[PDB]
């Protein structure tokens, strides 16, 4: 109900990552780590790199254990590449618990690291299936709760600012919660509504039904989950795929239309600004995704508002931001800007994500990001894609 030792235990913003505290060796070595529930390696800086001011000293800890195995981590935006050992590992602001666990030191890397992040390593939350090399390096949770009492459970509430933070307030200001073994709370208002964990691999989910503004983007559902959709706390945006991007840009465009904005800012690289305090968030529409409901024929939805899907960033005093819903090849991807909106439960333990709508999120005196239902829905296994 309450975990006091976890609350406001992350730092960091949508566009740079959301981190938690973490020790690594013996003495032990602190680190900011970021938590990713769109991987499942727990991976750490472990020799120089210009935007890192610290790094894993394997040959400073005692309970380093060589696994004299390498790694090679490449992904669309990037690589990492390192060697695999174990170490004693804790959560300073999480459960009161050193576990030992698998770590990859990382040796080298190409845009893995941002300048100015603060964070030195990665939290690979998801399970075994995608672990690098293969399903045989136990991810940190799995060792977790196999070498301790912590239930097979965690829980995400990231808070997004609503501004842009500089580097000494982004420093200075409590990100968001991590909380490990439970829910607290605290962190949200309203009723938590549970969809199915579709498959133990990435955080898997089933989309239902898209809306803007309530209206119906209409869309075969299959569409929403082509080849899948996923809940990662390491991606920025609401990634989209090509057609349900397409369909929902030009259904948020109509429903803006009211004021014209270049395609560089559809595209999502261009910032938008508004003279201080005039964003015109009324023109904006809201976006609800209906979830695959744990009873049958039934589902639910979230509802996020355009303070959640537009970004901000810095230009003058101006209120900037970009358009933080993109393109993908890859499936739908619920991601930081998203998860802002709402109360995260990662359930594994019964195989299923909760959504509440979160105590930290943004909004106007008009309207409030939404979590609700139930809805009849037929058909729902149908929106699955299989192949
Ligand atoms: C999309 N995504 C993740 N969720 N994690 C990784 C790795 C995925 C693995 C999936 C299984 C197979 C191997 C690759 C790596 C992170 C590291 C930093 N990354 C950023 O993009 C910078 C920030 C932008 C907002 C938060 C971080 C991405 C990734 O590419």
Redesign the pocket.
């Known amino acids: 109900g309450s975990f006091v030792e976890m609350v406001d235990n992350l730092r ?1 913003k ?5 981190y938690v505290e973490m020790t690594v060796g013996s003495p032990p070595q602190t680190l900011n780590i ?1 938590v ?6 727990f991976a750490v800086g472990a020799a120089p790199h210009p935007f890192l001011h610290r790094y894993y000293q394997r040959q400073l800890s005692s309970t380093y254990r060589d696994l004299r195995k390498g790694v090679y ?6 690589k ?1 590449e390192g060697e695999l050992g174990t170490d004693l590992v804790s959560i300073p602001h999480g459960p009161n618990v050193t576990v030992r666990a698998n770590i990859a030191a990382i040796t080298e890397s190409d ?4 300048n100015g ?1 603060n964070w030195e390593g ?1 939290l ?1 939350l ?1 399970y075994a299936e ?3 090399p293969d399903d045989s390096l136990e991810p940190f949770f799995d060792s977790l709760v196999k070498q301790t009492h912590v239930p097979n459970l965690f829980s995400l509430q990231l808070c997004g600012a609503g501004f842009p933070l500089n580097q000494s307030e982004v420093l200075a200001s409590v990100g968001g919660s991590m909380i490990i073994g439970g829910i607290d709370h605290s962190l949200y208002t309203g009723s938590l509504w549970y969809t199915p964990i579709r498959r133990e691999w ?1 955080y898997e989910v089933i989309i239902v039904r898209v809306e803007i503004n309530g209206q119906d983007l209409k869309m075969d559902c299959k569409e929403y989950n082509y080849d899948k959709s996923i809940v ?5 945006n609401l990634r989209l795929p090509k057609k349900v991007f397409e369909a929902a840009v030009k259904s948020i465009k109509a429903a803006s239309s009211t004021e014209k904005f270049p395609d560089g800012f559809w595209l999502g690289e261009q910032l938008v600004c508004w003279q201080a305090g005039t964003t015109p968030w009324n023109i904006f529409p809201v976006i609800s995704l209906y979830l695959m409901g744990e009873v049958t024929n039934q589902s639910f939805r979230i509802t996020i508002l355009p303070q959640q899907y537009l970004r901000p960033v810095e230009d003058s005093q101006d209120d900037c931001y970009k358009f933080a819903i993109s393109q993908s090849s890859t499936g739908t ?1 619920m ?2 800007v998203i998860m802002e909106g709402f109360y995260v439960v990662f359930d594994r333990a019964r195989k299923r994500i909760g959504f509440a709508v979160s105590a930290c999120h943004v909004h106007d005196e008009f309207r409030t990001a939404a979590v609700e239902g139930p809805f009849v829905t037929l058909d729902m296994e149908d929106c699955g894609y299989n192949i």
């Open positions: 960091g949508s566009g740079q990552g959301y970021l990713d529930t769109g991987s499942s390696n981590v490449p992904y669309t935006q990037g990492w845009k893995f690291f941002i992040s990665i690979g998801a995608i672990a690098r990435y990662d706390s390491g991606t920025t991807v991601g930081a």
